[PDB]
């Protein structure tokens, strides 16, 4: 009766990664991590990555659009597609028994779509809907405009399909995108609550199609732009970033610590942030309610770092300038050796409880197994983080004040400062 | 035994919708299945079907037909809708079976 | 195999203190953990004068204690990478902490400090006056929120359950430090509290740190006695708050539930799983198994619909809620009530064989993490008096068949006068009598 | 508890409601007719052929 | 099999803490599900 098991990893001749782990949980969760996304779109096929993840329930070469939804729901299972600008995960959850059942539809969707022209055409207007509900949160507005103002290509491409290309994505563009990117050396069959010998058997004696590395991406050229949206909303969102560090970078951990030094989102419900020098530093400058956190993204070949301020209209200027000064003062040395250790503690915490969930665990395993075909022991990831000096943090702050900034802000920008005013 | 081909080719000419310049699938009665299959047709094939039908309609009100030269040959008849119609039926039979079990 | 992994879940340990406080834990090998106190207190325990006091208290829980004021308390909690969170319902208040498994004893001390030695600074209260008054204006634009409050306001009209958790504007305006302190002393008492924990925590060391910081024994029998709340009367009624300028309309319809104790609550969840839920982002579309969802897609009946079985101590609310355009309401309500009758009349074994599988996957998904396990544990004791393992839930669920779903639904739904809450542009949906006649004969 | 006992059995399912009305109309007809007939004949004693019949049967 | 939905069209939160937790911890994930409301982070 159940005990402590190890995580296993296998690399097929295909270049395919199989990262499994048995935890004896009554719920299995299998995913297919793929290096796809809008990062590989060009001006000719914009939005084909968005339509692609909406195209999951469409007919496949082995399962009808009917049987996919009906067969999965027949066993309480669920199918979902999460994707960023340069990653694509196809997940399935179900009871331990009906793994093989739901595994079929998962395999059919990712490795054998048909993209029937009439089904594709009928799906096109869902782009309008899915975008409209996601854009209800003002952050996705400036966050998409940020990448547009930060880069020139690849990462500059929007995560949600642009309006002008809705209904104008061909069924052939979906086929080409899957053929060029969903290749074996770019994917990983990652499972949880499954024996490795089974997950391995499935990946080879069922899963194949185009091998190799396929279409590559033009590495992200930096721009440094200033996109501003005037929409009269009483609240003004604003983001200011420079080039950060990539995934698996040396300066990667240094920025994450600087993030918690400045502070990233309250840890106490309805609570002020004391550890946050950013939250506090702005609070001294403005009177009214607001939010100001540290912003940090790490991509494969680049990254962004800075601050995001949700503030009132006329007090946007006060908050933004104050939030800027906090990174200036942080670069001028204003970082206690305890602040680092306190941030290195907050960070080691955040990481650990994030992997509590089934989503967090499968993602964390599959993320690394996809890029660097290994899983790092949680003790060593705890080593790599607190092996960051106090100087490394002040250095990361120095790079912000020095580097070329790119700003995205949407709201009533009547009192929102331009980028050449910071 | 080339008998079956003899009989089909005979009926095709005896039917005489080729005199109107109509394909076999043009004369298909549009029930729920045919209606759905038609909506799956590519633009070009659909716009062409539309003209052939409107031409047959115009001919019918004239009580005239096309010249013998413009009659659709039996071997030149394109079953353009039949592959679509078969999948529409196959899909439906699946649902009807899946809703009983 | 699934059947074995249920049997092999570490049982939840329970021990009781001198003062009646219960301590429960689910020990795993987690470097992190969640541990807090689930109190049997809410807006039902409140009344006309102190309505929303427990919510006013919830605002002042994290704002510092006697031993350590606001500045120190927030700084101490943040530094250990620990997250402090909580809530308050109509019948249940909770305050819990997410932290490393090593900080467990310090956490319990931090928890015990808030529930007992809360500061309630006279100056701090005046700040949260405007804070809550803003959260009221902000929640007032949540149409789903406004509807469900209205549902309670008319279903349990004239009783304690008809009150909102946040309370009146007048009450928030005029609540005193004395009123707040009174609520805390009256309700936050050891026997009505459960110290739950889940993660890499030794149960023994949990009850030890608990034994230390949860001290004082009660003297009389009264302070050992847990109050028996006065019953709440259901009313076949409706409340229609009309606003045609409102973009989309919200409608909630419900019958009276059985209560936490009743084993029929399991069947009602199986039945609710059959109809399920939907919103226009459900990729399944027209092929969804849920009949109401399929009809909702085929005829564009609604933006979203959900079914709920909100249970309370002695009662509940079995019903559904949907969001629709001004001219799709009547057809949506029509189909919804039709599927209700379909439950009582036509429910097939094939349908519940799916519904059971969904409910199985649901209750397991409910326990994904330390906090949702702690939430279950803190509530299971507070409502059932014990922990119900997933193994036991499965046994109850697996015994559900179509003949049973028909009976239980016919018992709570058929020919019953429902409660109706309707907000927004609501002309197409009209007359209670028509809605009432939709309660019988499929 | 007739008002309840009648509801559960007779008035619940739309079927038993109809069967109640059908059988209720059968009972009502026998009852009402005999009743009204009695009230009318008693109000007119010695006036109907029903009464003065015997006076003319030397058959 | 879990998660709340929404509804809008095409063609407030004004207090420091009830609109807190939003400023992009990371950046922007985009989730869509066969039977679950479209996620967004
Ligand atoms: C005598 C022996 C033979 C008897 C034959 C009986 C024939 C009739 C069979 C039974 C028919 C009735 C079946 C059930 C009817 C029914 O359900 O009524 C519905 C519905 C009420 O239902 P709810 O109360 O909502 O039900 C909730 C509980 N589920 O409708 C009614 O109320 C019907 C009663 C109103 C009728 C009023 C008619 C008055 C008109 C004047 C009479 C004129 C008579 C002469 C007409 C002849 C032509 C010149």
Automatic annotation (TrEMBL), chain A:
It is a peripheral membrane protein. It comes from the Eukaryota. Residues 19-163 form the Peptidase M16 N-terminal domain. The keyword Transport applies. It is found in: Mitochondrion inner membrane. Residues 168-347 form the Peptidase M16 C-terminal domain. GO terms for molecular function: metal ion binding. Keywords: Acetylation, Electron transport, Membrane, Mitochondrion, Mitochondrion inner membrane, Respiratory chain, Transit peptide, Transport. SUPFAM superfamilies: LuxS/MPP-like metallohydrolase. GO terms for cellular component: mitochondrial inner membrane; respiratory chain complex III. Belongs to the peptidase M16 family. UQCRC2/QCR2 subfamily. Component of the ubiquinol-cytochrome c oxidoreductase (cytochrome b-c1 complex, complex III, CIII), a multisubunit enzyme composed of 11 subunits. The complex is composed of 3 respiratory subunits cytochrome b, cytochrome c1 and Rieske protein UQCRFS1, 2 core protein subunits UQCRC1/QCR1 and UQCRC2/QCR2, and 6 low-molecular weight protein subunits UQCRH/QCR6, UQCRB/QCR7, UQCRQ/QCR8, UQCR10/QCR9, UQCR11/QCR10 and subunit 9, the cleavage product of Rieske protein UQCRFS1. This is Cytochrome b-c1 complex subunit 2, mitochondrial. The lineage of its organism: Eukaryota, Metazoa, Chordata, Craniata, Vertebrata.
UniProtKB/TrEMBL annotation, chain B:
Its main location: mitochondrion. Belongs to the UQCRB/QCR7 family. The keyword Cytoplasm does not apply. GO terms for biological process: mitochondrial electron transport, ubiquinol to cytochrome c. It is found in: Mitochondrion inner membrane. This is Cytochrome b-c1 complex subunit 7. Component of the ubiquinol-cytochrome c oxidoreductase, a multisubunit transmembrane complex that is part of the mitochondrial electron transport chain which drives oxidative phosphorylation. GO terms for cellular component: mitochondrial inner membrane; respiratory chain complex III. It comes from Gallus gallus (Chicken). It is a peripheral membrane protein. Gene3D superfamilies: Cytochrome b-c1 complex subunit 7. Keywords: Electron transport, Membrane, Mitochondrion, Mitochondrion inner membrane, Respiratory chain, Transport.
TrEMBL record, chain C:
Keywords: Acetylation, Electron transport, Membrane, Mitochondrion, Mitochondrion inner membrane, Phosphoprotein, Respiratory chain, Transit peptide, Transport. Residues 175-358 form the Peptidase M16 C-terminal domain. Signal peptide: none annotated. It is found in: Mitochondrion inner membrane. Residues 22-168 form the Peptidase M16 N-terminal domain. Component of the ubiquinol-cytochrome c oxidoreductase (cytochrome b-c1 complex, complex III, CIII), a multisubunit enzyme composed of 11 subunits. The complex is composed of 3 respiratory subunits cytochrome b, cytochrome c1 and Rieske protein UQCRFS1, 2 core protein subunits UQCRC1/QCR1 and UQCRC2/QCR2, and 6 low-molecular weight protein subunits UQCRH/QCR6, UQCRB/QCR7, UQCRQ/QCR8, UQCR10/QCR9, UQCR11/QCR10 and subunit 9, the cleavage product of Rieske protein UQCRFS1. This is Cytochrome b-c1 complex subunit 1, mitochondrial. It comes from Gallus gallus.
From TrEMBL, chain D:
It is found in: Mitochondrion inner membrane. It is a single-pass membrane protein. One of its GO terms (biological process) is mitochondrial electron transport, ubiquinol to cytochrome c. Pfam families: UCR_UQCRX_QCR9. One of its GO terms (cellular component) is mitochondrial inner membrane. Keywords: Electron transport, Membrane, Mitochondrion, Mitochondrion inner membrane, Respiratory chain, Transmembrane, Transmembrane helix, Transport. The keyword Transmembrane applies. Gene3D superfamilies: Cytochrome b-c1 complex subunit 9. It comes from the Eukaryota. Its main location: mitochondrion. Component of the ubiquinol-cytochrome c oxidoreductase, a multisubunit transmembrane complex that is part of the mitochondrial electron transport chain which drives oxidative phosphorylation. The complex plays an important role in the uptake of multiple carbon sources present in different host niches. Component of the ubiquinol-cytochrome c oxidoreductase (cytochrome b-c1 complex, complex III, CIII), a multisubunit enzyme composed of 11 subunits. The complex is composed of 3 respiratory subunits cytochrome b, cytochrome c1 and Rieske protein UQCRFS1, 2 core protein subunits UQCRC1/QCR1 and UQCRC2/QCR2, and 6 low-molecular weight protein subunits UQCRH/QCR6, UQCRB/QCR7, UQCRQ/QCR8, UQCR10/QCR9, UQCR11/QCR10 and subunit 9, the cleavage product of Rieske protein UQCRFS1. Belongs to the UQCR10/QCR9 family. This is Complex III subunit 9. It comes from Gallus gallus (Chicken).
């Amino acid at each position: 009766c159940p005990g402590a098991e190890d995580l296993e990893i296998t690399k097929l001749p295909n270049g395919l990664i199989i990262a499994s782990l048995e935890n004896f949980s009554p719920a299995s969760r299998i995913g297919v991590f793929i290096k796809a996304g809008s990062r590989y779109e060009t001006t000719a096929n914009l939005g084909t990555a968005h339509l692609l993840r909406l195209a999951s329930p469409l007919t496949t070469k082995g399962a009808s659009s009917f049987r996919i939804t009906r067969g999965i729901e027949a066993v309480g299972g669920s199918l979902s597609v999460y994707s960023t600008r340069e990653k694509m995960t196809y997940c399935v959850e179900c009871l331990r028994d009906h793994v093989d059942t739901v595994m079929e539809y998962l395999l059919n969707v990712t490795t054998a779509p048909e993209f029937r022209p009439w089904e594709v055409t009928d799906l096109q207007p869902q782009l309008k809907v899915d975008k409209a509900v996601a854009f209800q949160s003002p952050q996705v507005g400036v966050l998409e405009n940020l990448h547009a103002a930060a880069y020139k290509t690849a990462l500059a491409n929007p995560l949600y399909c642009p309006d002008y290309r809705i209904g104008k994505i061909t069924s052939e563009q979906l086929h080409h995108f899957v053929q060029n990117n969903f290749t074996s050396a770019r994917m990983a069959l990652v499972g949880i609550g499954v024996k490795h010998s089974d997950l391995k058997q499935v990946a080879e004696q069922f899963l194949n199609i185009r091998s190799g590395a396929g279409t590559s991406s033009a590495k992200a050229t930096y721009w440094g732009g200033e996109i501003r949206e005037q929409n009269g909303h009483s609240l003004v969102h604003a983001a200011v970033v420079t080039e950060g560090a990539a995934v698996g970078s040396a300066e990667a951990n240094a920025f994450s610590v600087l993030q918690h030094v400045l502070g990233a989102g309250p840890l106490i419900k309805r609570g002020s942030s004391v550890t946050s020098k950013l939250y506090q530093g702005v609070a001294k400058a403005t009177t009214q309610p607001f939010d100001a956190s540290a912003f940090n993204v790490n991509y494969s070949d680049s990254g962004l770092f800075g601050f995001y301020t949700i503030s009132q209209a006329a007090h946007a200027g006060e908050v933004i300038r104050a939030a800027m000064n906090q990174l200036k003062a942080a670069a001028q040395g204003g970082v206690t050796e305890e602040d680092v250790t306190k941030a290195k503690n907050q960070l080691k915490a955040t990481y650990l409880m994030s992997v509590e969930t089934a989503q967090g665990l499968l993602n964390e395993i599959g993320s690394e197994a996809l890029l660097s075909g290994t899983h790092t022991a949680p003790s060593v990831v705890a080593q790599k983080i607190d092996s960051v000096t106090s100087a490394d943090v002040v250095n990361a702050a120095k790079k912000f004040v020095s580097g070329k900034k790119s700003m995205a802000a949407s709201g009533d920008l009547g009192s929102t400062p331009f980028l050449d005013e910071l | 035994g080339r008998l079956m081909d003899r009989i089909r080719k005979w009926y095709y000419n005896a039917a005489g919708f080729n005199k109107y310049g109509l394909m076999r699938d043009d004369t298909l009665y549009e029930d729920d299945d045919v209606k759905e299959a038609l909506k799956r047709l590519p633009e070009d094939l659909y716009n062409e079907r539309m003209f052939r039908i409107k031409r047959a309609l115009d001919l019918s009100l004239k009580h005239r037909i096309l010249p013998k030269e413009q009659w659709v040959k039996y071997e030149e008849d394109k079953p353009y809708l039949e592959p679509y119609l078969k999948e529409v039926i196959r899909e439906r039979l699946e649902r009807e079976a899946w809703n009983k079990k | 195999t699934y059947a074995q992994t249920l049997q092999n879940i570490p049982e939840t340990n329970v021990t009781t203190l001198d003062n009646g406080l219960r301590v429960a834990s689910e020990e795993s090998s987690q470097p992190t953990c969640t541990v807090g106190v689930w109190i049997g207190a809410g807006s039902r325990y409140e009344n006309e004068k102190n309505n929303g006091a427990g919510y006013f208290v919830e605002h002042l829980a994290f704002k510092g204690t006697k031993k350590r004021p606001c500045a120190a308390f927030e700084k101490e909690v943040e530094s250990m990478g620990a997250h402090f969170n909580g809530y308050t319902s109509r019948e249940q208040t909770a305050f819990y902490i997410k932290a490393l498994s090593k900080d467990m004893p310090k956490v319990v001390e931090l928890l015990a400090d808030v529930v007992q030695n809360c500061a309630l600074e006279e100056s701090q209260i005046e700040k949260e006056r405007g804070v809550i008054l803003q959260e009221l204006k902000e929640m007032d634009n949540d149409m789903t929120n406004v509807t469900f409050d209205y549902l309670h306001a008319t279903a349990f009209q004239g009783t304690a359950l008809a009150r909102t958790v946040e309370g009146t504007t007048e009450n928030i305006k005029h609540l005193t430090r004395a009123d707040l302190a009174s609520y805390i002393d009256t309700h936050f008492k050891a026997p009505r509290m459960v110290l739950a924990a889940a993660g890499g925590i030794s149960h023994k060391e949990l009850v030890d740190a608990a034994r230390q910081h949860f001290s004082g024994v009660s003297f009389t029998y009264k302070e050992d006695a847990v109050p028996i709340l006065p019953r709440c009367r259901f009313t076949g009624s409706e409340i229609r708050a009309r606003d045609d300028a409102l973009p989309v309309a919200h409608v909630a319809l419900a019958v009276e539930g059985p209560g936490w104790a009743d084993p029929d609550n399991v069947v009602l969840h199986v039945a609710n799983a059959i109809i399920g839920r939907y919103d226009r982002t459900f990729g399944g579309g027209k092929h969804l198994s849920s009949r109401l969802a399929a009809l909702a897609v085929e005829h564009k009946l609604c933006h979203s619909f959900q079914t709920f079985n909100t249970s309370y101590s002695d009662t509940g609310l079995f019903g559904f809620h949907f969001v629709a355009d001004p001219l799709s309401i009547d057809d949506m309500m029509f189909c919804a009530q039709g599927e209700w009758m379909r439950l009582c009349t036509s429910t097939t074994e094939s349908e519940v064989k799916r519904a059971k599988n969904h409910l199985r996957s649901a209750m397991v998904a409910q326990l994904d993490g330390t906090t949702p396990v702690c939430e279950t544990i803190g509530s299971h004791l507070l409502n059932y008096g014990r922990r119900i393992s997933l193994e036991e839930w499965d046994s109850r669920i697996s015994a559900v068949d179509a003949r049973m779903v028909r009976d239980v639904c016919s018992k709570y739904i058929y020919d019953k006068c429902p409660a109706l809450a309707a907000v927004g542009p609501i002309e197409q949906l009209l007359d209670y009598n028509r809605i009432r006649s939709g309660m019988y004969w499929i | 508890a007739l008002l309840r006992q009648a509801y559960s059995a007779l008035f619940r399912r739309t079927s038993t409601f109809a069967l109640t009305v059908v059988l209720g109309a059968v009972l009502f007809e026998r009852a009402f007719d005999q009743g009204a007939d009695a009230i009318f004949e008693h109000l007119n004693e010695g006036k109907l052929w029903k009464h003065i019949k015997h006076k003319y049967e030397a058959s | 099999x879990x998660x709340x939905x929404x509804x809008x069209x095409x063609x407030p939160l004004l207090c420091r803490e009830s609109m807190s937790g939003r400023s992009a911890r990371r950046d922007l994930v985009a989730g869509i599900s066969l039977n679950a409301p479209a996620s967004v982070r």
